[PDB]
Amino acid sequence: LDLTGYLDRINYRGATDPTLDVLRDLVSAHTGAIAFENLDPLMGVPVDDLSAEALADKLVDRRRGGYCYEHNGLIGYVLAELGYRVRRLAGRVVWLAPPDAPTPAQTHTVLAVTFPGCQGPYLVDVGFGGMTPTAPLRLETGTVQQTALEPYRLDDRGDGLVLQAMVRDEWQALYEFSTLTRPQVDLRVGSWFVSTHPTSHFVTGLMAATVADDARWNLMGRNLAIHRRGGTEKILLEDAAAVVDTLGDRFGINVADVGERGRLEARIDKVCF
Template sequence: MAPDTAAYLARIDHRSTVEPTLDTLHALVAGHNRSIPFENLDPLMGIPVHDLSAQALTAKLVHRRRGGYCYENNGVLGYVLEDLGYGVDRLAGRVVWMQPPGAPQAGLTHNVLAVTVPGEEGRFLVDVGFGGQTLSSPIRLQAGPVQQTRHEPYRLVEHPEGMALQTRIHDDWLPLYQFSLRTQPLVDLSIGSWYSSTYPDAVFVVGLSVALVTDDARWNLRGRNLAIHAGGGTEKIRLNSAADVLDQITGRFGIDVAGLGDVEARISQVLDS
């Protein structure tokens, strides 16, 4: 089933052309960044995320005004891009962001998009689902050159698994994830999402993560800790209670928590996770 593209465009406040051009792709990514948050409330509340169909993702992220993690954010955007005339390949990645040297290898539990734009050579890496450090613009799927986004510069480097994405922060190049260039079938992505949302020690099951990328800042919430990265600096705010955290989730991040149960009580259990 096709996504409700008109409703999606309204959700991200996209009011200009929908011709499948590179400019439109940039506008869609920016609109998604600022409108649909990264969040893991379903796994945190014990709700598995395994249905990655266009119907399910549109119902949750568009009509119910929720967010999601990589499989959901990139999933719904991928369906919309296909509907608009872009070519979309879904790829799987392995997160290495903030991992200490020698840490155990992570599973292939990240999902990104390789997008073909009519009339443009090559493909573009699109990722609206990596939380606080997600790409804020499409970049060419090409190893080597530094590529500027609406926020930080990024680059792709060759990797034995395919490619690896790095970002430059304070003059240091830091790795985010590595990914294969092999297209992944939906069944494999669904298995990765089910694992990420149900495995007892999975990061999305044991702690709260919420993020939103506005035009001039990155808003990251982890437990009770809110970080606002803007203008080369960072403001850190320690929230006092689960009620304060919930106020940020529904206010600043605009997430509708209706139907999820006692979210405040669950947040109180993971304030310092």
């Protein structure tokens, strides 16, 4: 119910009516202000509470980032309060995987959004780390949808859909999802798995992502990548202390919220180095 707190956090100043332009402006403000991060699962802190109060406490009041369940959870509550009709969906991540790869777990969550006067439903995803669409996408197959960054495309895959994006020089399948509404409890089960399981990439490693000035800032451990329209520059971070500095400065995460910096640096040192 802390609508004001959220809007100030994302530095939004426009209108609040449930329209297409507002949805575009909110998604752009959210993706540019709240970083993607897995500092909680990395530090052995599970992501179990997906209520409006818990997510606003962390992502707004404490100035932290989060992952898919936290990002799409928070924006989903905000949009519902503004008058948008929000349906929470579940997805399986297939990024960089070939078509014959083993069936992935349902560890991603996206939103199907409608509003007064809309021609059709819209896909909203502000929680897909390094490749999250910075614009609401028409929930329709075949159409190429250009954003402020990469172009996106949805295609019909079996009993559901698949979101694809043109990364570098080829169309890459990001995730496959069903358009069926999933209850909150199913999302909690998925979030528990991805934040506690010893095999999860969010437990074993560090991942951080943001968007700032027509560019994508992606961090995989000590590997920082800045993806621009022109090209990509890669920076190999020297030590765990420099990694924490990047998380605080470049990514705008309140690192002090995690606890003693020495413990976070030691965890990054043992995991990334």
